[PDB]
Design a protein around this ligand. Structure first.
Ligand SMILES: [Mg+2]
Ligand SMILES: [Mg+2]
Ligand SMILES: [Mg+2]
Ligand SMILES: [Mg+2]
Ligand SMILES: [Mg+2]
Ligand SMILES: [Mg+2]
Ligand SMILES: [Mg+2]
Ligand SMILES: [Mg+2]
Ligand SMILES: [Mg+2]
Ligand SMILES: [Mg+2]
Ligand SMILES: [Mg+2]
Ligand SMILES: [Mg+2]
Ligand SMILES: [Mg+2]
Ligand SMILES: [Mg+2]
Ligand SMILES: [Mg+2]
Ligand SMILES: [Mg+2]
Ligand SMILES: [Mg+2]
Ligand SMILES: [Mg+2]
Ligand SMILES: [Mg+2]
Ligand SMILES: [Mg+2]
Ligand SMILES: [Mg+2]
Ligand SMILES: [Mg+2]
Ligand SMILES: [Mg+2]
Ligand SMILES: [Mg+2]
Ligand SMILES: [Mg+2]
Ligand SMILES: [Mg+2]
Ligand SMILES: [Mg+2]
Ligand SMILES: [Mg+2]
Ligand SMILES: [Mg+2]
Ligand SMILES: [Zn+2]
Lengths: 69, 106, 93, 50, 93, 248
RNA sequence: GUAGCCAAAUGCCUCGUCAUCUAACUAGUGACGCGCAUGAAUGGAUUAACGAGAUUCCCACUGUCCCUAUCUACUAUCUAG
RNA sequence: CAGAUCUUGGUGGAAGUAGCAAAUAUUCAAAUGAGAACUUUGAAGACUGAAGUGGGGAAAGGUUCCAUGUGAACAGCAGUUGGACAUGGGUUAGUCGAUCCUAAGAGAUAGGGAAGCUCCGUAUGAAAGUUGCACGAUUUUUCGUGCCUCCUAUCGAAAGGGAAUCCGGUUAAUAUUCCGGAACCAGAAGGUGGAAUCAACACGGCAACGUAAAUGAAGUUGGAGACGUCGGCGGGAGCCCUGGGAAGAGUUCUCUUUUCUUUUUAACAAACCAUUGAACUACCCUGAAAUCGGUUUAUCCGGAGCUAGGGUAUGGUGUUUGGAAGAGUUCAGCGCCUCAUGCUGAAUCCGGUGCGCUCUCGACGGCCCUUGAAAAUCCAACGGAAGAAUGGCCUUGUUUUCACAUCUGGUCGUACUCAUAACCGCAGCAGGUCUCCAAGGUGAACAGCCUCUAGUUGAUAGAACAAUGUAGAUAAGGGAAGUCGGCAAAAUGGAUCCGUAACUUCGGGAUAAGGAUUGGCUCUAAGGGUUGGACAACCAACUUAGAACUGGUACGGACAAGGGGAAUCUGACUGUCUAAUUAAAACAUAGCAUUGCGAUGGCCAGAAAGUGGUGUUGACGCAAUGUGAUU
């Protein structure tokens, strides 16, 4: 598992071809984790905002598979 | 309290049977079998451990990038900094003495 | 305080082995554990490592010296060196 | 011991197989005296000796 | 029971089975006292209450079992400072 | 009777314990450089050799014919130190640690690890504190006379090499062992020769000294030189016996 | 047969003789020594410390004894197998 | 055949006898059943008491494992039950082992012995060659000679060396192997991306050294693998203990803001990092120290450059995170034949502690006539082989020791027991058999004693209380009169404070001897840390000494736990042996002495040998004897 600290970095990994799916995890503390499954690693980005989470979810590639936990 | 068992069939406290205790996300106390500790390369002239290089088992060194296994200097990763400095000064002074002894031989 | 009038380091042996034997061991043990002076560096950091081998501490002169079993130099070795030096200096000239 | 060689394991399989009752129709044959056998080995009683 | 023992009950001579050394190693007491005195000496030097010349004399005195506790050291420092300033006042006058 | 203990020391459990030994202590193969000139080596290590009183010196020499360095194992002479230069050959100087033909050194010099035959790589005066003395040369048909640690006088060819100085490790035997356990540890790294049961403590089947209703030998313990194995026990071919009062 | 040592784990005679301890000792210890047959690395003498070694005694202690008694458990005993 | 302690087989009296008594212990109800002291369930009473009657392994066994049945034989009583019997089922790996490596050793080959079976030998008296170069070879590459160079059989470790896996779940029965999720290693090809190179293979930093990459052939050199033991000191992890909150439970005449349980976080990845715990540990720079300073529990360090100031490296079982709450745990409800056993809510939080325990790491100290494997394998350097981009730019090689991606990882083992019933001992035998984890109280303590988790309640039973036993207690007065002899037993015993003879090798003797004290409660004094403006309100603490009061004139209240002294013989001491009648004064030992021998040798071996040991040796040595520390 690897953590991604930049939204720009996370979007670039998603646009890659190995990026199969994404996961949305909503924690009790109103923080949102975006998890990207590549061949070798699972990449998590922690978004501490609901507004930012919505924009990031809309910022994803349209063909990316985003799954809700 | 919770007591543990070896996870392998090796039943003896040998140096290849090193363990440490982990507490798991199931609230289980159990062993984790671990390796012997690494060793830093040592200077070929003085035996001192060489700076800038991690302590690893011998084959783990095959996985590092080149610059992690050496120092950017002559004999880097093979001689210490002070050993190299002795070699440079010694080589120069000895060569100069060979020059004067050749000059005074004629 | 003194803690011992005679046996010194040999007090570890207690009353065993005989007084003469403990006294002979005492003289040698004081020698073999003494600090001696390094002629190459001038420090008194010369201690024995196994019977004829005398080592030095510090960053300088990490050399090892071949010496006597219980002292750094023996009288026989010292006398031999001067004998050898005299013989060397008489065929030289 | 559960640490065992293949050759040992093959022998154990064979030993277990010979350690079975004879089917009755074998002893029902005309002219057969296979009614009882002295080859019923048991693990605690008679040892294999490799 | 442990609460009572905290207040000092159940700890008389009839309640001890180990030696005093078995109960409380004297080497631990000494190590604690030395670490306490050395920390005090270091604090005083860092604040300028004592200078390195007095610190060195007191350090070797503390190693030699001169002060039973922090108080004995503090009174001794106060006595030493009072005497030194007296010589300074004598000389400066 | 049965095979006595001395007859069983032919191998097996009586072999030397050699796992902890780093190499035999040898002079260096007599080569062109040593025959005609000298060659320089540097002392790399001075090390303890289990089962040997004297320390050993690992000395690095350049190979004259190939790009490579050859490490030699010498018996350290007293005074030797790591980083010292040692010189071996006919033209080497008369300094402690150098290796020279005995014919090239004056009468009276103190030497060690001396060859019996030129090139045997060291036989005489090798144990701790021991040495050999040069007694004289006979230039016609070059033979050098030397005195050995036993006191014997020997004639070696004046091409046999020797090391200048005395073997290091000093007066080791001056210290009482004081304890069975210390003798145990001394011979543990040597061979299976300790402790020793006395012959008279045995039965007649075990030893010629065995048996009897008191512990005694019976016949004389000075036995002839030509005794068979199994009867060659006690004081073999003794010229004399008893406490000597003044010898030579 | 020197220095030593001894009726000694070595003395037959022998329960040697004298002294000591005991009410009383063929014990023990100390002396003595023409020692059947002690004695010098076939090691003599001495010896602190150590000893599940041998030997004599004293204090403590006590059913070892005077002189036996009492109590518990398991047997023995009777029953089924 | 009457005999032979005759042979083989069968069968008697002894006899319903000896006996089936070690390891504290069983009881009530129910179910099942023809039948229950022995099966199963519930309840009670107990035990092992973490150096286990607990949880695993190595060796050995080999199916004993699991389910369903059975109950002739076996389970020295019983049997509805069983490790018995019958029918079926059960062991899943690139990451755990083996496999690879070498060790003591084994052992082909050369060669030599031997009538021969075979013996010696292991680069050995051998033409004992896998590896290093492109000279041909189109043309973008491993087949022909070449000149070359100190290479090498193999076997030998399920505890040594060694590439790589963790958590949660799952079965009647396997699991680091299956499932879910999350990783890692090795090899191959080169699939993209990036980096350097306009002529060549990067920059930064005074330096220690740093980075996302940063060309490097032969040869050489260096490193890792790779190493004893004891002692204390410092840190970490798990455990232990403690203060609150929460959820559930136990108790509740009275009391108890109570008592108990749960309150978890892996491999791997990233960034920091002496902060918060553990460094001035090592090194570098500035600077130049006597009024010498620094400094550890332990006295080492400095003009060969101290103190100080600032840096560099080493880096997790530390921190902050990803993994990861979605898992696990605890609790509360809903459908209610319910089905795929689904669905819905809460909590899983915040603090502290250490001469503690187990493991581990770090820096050290002591000791040795003792100085404490090897090899496979991996890495680094020194060196400079080789390369071909060029038309000021659309144009190659390298790097895959930089990132992401692809393929592949065979074969054998894997159930279960590991022992008062799975092994050996004729057996389900009070014997024997290597090792890992290890809670609370008391206490010095892994002692004894009690308890929690776990396990077990299994050792034929019932009744009775005769003699004589075995095991365990007590005894008036006397106190060794007993006896070969204090044999056996008694007495002593912990700790604190007093006190302690001869003799002595000066170390000891010594816990000599010989005295006193010891509970509970209520206080007093002294001894250390965090922390607010000469000081200080808490919090976090543990000792030691003393006083008063008090009661069974008691208190190491059980448990635990020396009797002591005066002498003689003898062996100096620690050590060793007659497995199963001898443990000693016997043996050994240090010490002392003597003997042989300088290698064409001494001692020992072999049938022989081009053979072996001492010998990786050399008189401060090897070999052969005697005596037995010292004096
Ligand atoms: Mg005998
Ligand atoms: Mg004979
Ligand atoms: Mg007498
Ligand atoms: Mg004599
Ligand atoms: Mg009877
Ligand atoms: Mg008949
Ligand atoms: Mg007849
Ligand atoms: Mg008959
Ligand atoms: Mg009966
Ligand atoms: Mg008990
Ligand atoms: Mg109990
Ligand atoms: Mg089990
Ligand atoms: Mg069966
Ligand atoms: Mg493995
Ligand atoms: Mg192998
Ligand atoms: Mg299982
Ligand atoms: Mg298993
Ligand atoms: Mg068996
Ligand atoms: Mg009485
Ligand atoms: Mg009475
Ligand atoms: Mg009395
Ligand atoms: Mg009497
Ligand atoms: Mg009588
Ligand atoms: Mg007794
Ligand atoms: Mg003895
Ligand atoms: Mg016996
Ligand atoms: Mg016996
Ligand atoms: Mg003896
Ligand atoms: Mg003597
Ligand atoms: Zn020096």
């Amino acid at each position: 598992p690897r953590q991604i600290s930049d939204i720009k970095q996370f979007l670039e990994i998603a646009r890659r071809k190995d990026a199969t799916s994404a996961r949305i995890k909503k924690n009790t503390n109103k923080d949102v984790k975006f998890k990207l499954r590549c061949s070798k690693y699972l990449y998590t980005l922690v978004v501490a905002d609901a507004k930012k989470a919505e924009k990031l979810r809309q910022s994803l590639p349209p063909d990316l598979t985003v799954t809700e936990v | 309290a919770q007591r543990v068992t070896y996870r392998r069939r090796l039943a003896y406290n040998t140096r290849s049977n090193k363990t440490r205790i982990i507490k798991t996300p199931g609230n289980n106390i159990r062993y984790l079998h671990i390796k012997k500790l690494g060793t830093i390369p040592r200077c070929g002239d003085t035996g001192v451990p060489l700076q800038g290089i991690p302590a690893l088992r011998p084959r783990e060194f095959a996985r590092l990038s080149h610059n992690q296994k050496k120092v950017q200097r002559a004999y880097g990763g093979c001689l210490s900094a002070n050993a190299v400095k002795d070699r440079i000064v010694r080589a120069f002074l000895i060569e100069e003495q060979k020059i004067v002894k050749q000059k005074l031989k004629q | 305080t003194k803690r011992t009038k005679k046996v010194g380091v040999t007090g570890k042996y207690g009353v065993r082995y005989g007084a003469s034997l403990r006294r002979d061991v005492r003289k040698i043990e004081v020698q073999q554990h003494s600090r001696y002076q390094c002629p190459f560096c001038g420090r008194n950091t010369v201690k024995r490592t196994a019977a004829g081998i005398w080592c030095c501490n510090g960053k300088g002169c990490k050399k090892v010296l071949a010496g006597g079993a219980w002292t750094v130099t023996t009288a026989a070795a010292t006398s031999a060196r001067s004998t050898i030096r005299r013989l060397r200096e008489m065929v030289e000239v | 011991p559960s640490h065992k060689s293949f050759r040992t394991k093959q022998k154990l399989a064979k030993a277990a197989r010979q350690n079975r009752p004879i089917p009755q129709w074998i002893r029902l044959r005309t002219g057969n005296t296979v009614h009882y056998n002295m080859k019923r080995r048991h693990w605690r009683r008679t040892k294999l000796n490799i | 029971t442990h609460a009572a023992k905290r207040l000092g009950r159940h700890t008389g001579y009839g309640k001890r089975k180990g030696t005093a050394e078995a109960r409380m190693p004297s080497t631990v007491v000494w190590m604690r006292r030395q670490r306490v005195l050395r920390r005090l000496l270091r604090k005083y030097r860092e604040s300028g209450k004592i200078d390195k010349h007095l610190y060195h004399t007191l350090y070797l005195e503390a190693k030699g079992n001169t002060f039973k506790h922090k108080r004995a050291l503090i009174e001794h420092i106060q006595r030493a400072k009072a005497e030194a300033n007296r010589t300074k006042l004598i000389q400066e006058q | 009777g049965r095979v006595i203990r001395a007859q069983r020391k032919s191998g097996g459990i009586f072999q030397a314990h050699t796992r902890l030994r780093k190499g035999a202590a040898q002079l260096r193969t007599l080569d062109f450089a040593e025959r005609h000139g000298y060659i320089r080596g540097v002392v790399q290590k001075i090390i303890h050799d289990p089962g040997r009183g004297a320390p050993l010196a690992k000395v690095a020499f350049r190979n004259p014919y190939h790009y490579r360095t050859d490490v030699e194992t010498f018996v350290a002479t007293e005074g030797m130190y790591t980083g010292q230069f040692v010189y071996c050959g006919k033209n080497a100087a008369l300094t402690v640690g150098n290796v020279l033909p005995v014919g090239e050194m004056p009468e009276g010099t103190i030497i060690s690890n001396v060859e019996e035959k030129a090139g045997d790589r060291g036989a005489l005066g090798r144990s701790s504190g021991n040495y050999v003395i040069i007694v004289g040369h006979d230039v016609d048909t070059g033979k050098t006379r030397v005195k050995l640690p036993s006191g014997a006088k020997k004639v070696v060819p004046s091409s046999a090499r020797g090391v200048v100085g005395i073997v290091a490790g000093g007066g080791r035997i001056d210290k009482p062992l004081l304890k069975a356990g210390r003798a145990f540890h001394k011979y543990r790294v040597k061979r299976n020769c300790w402790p020793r049961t006395r012959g008279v403590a045995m039965n007649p089947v075990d030893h010629p000294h065995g048996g009897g209703n008191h512990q005694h030998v019976g016949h004389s313990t000075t036995v002839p030189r030509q005794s068979a194995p199994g009867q060659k026990v006690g004081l073999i071919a003794a010229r004399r016996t008893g406490l000597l009062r003044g010898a030579a």
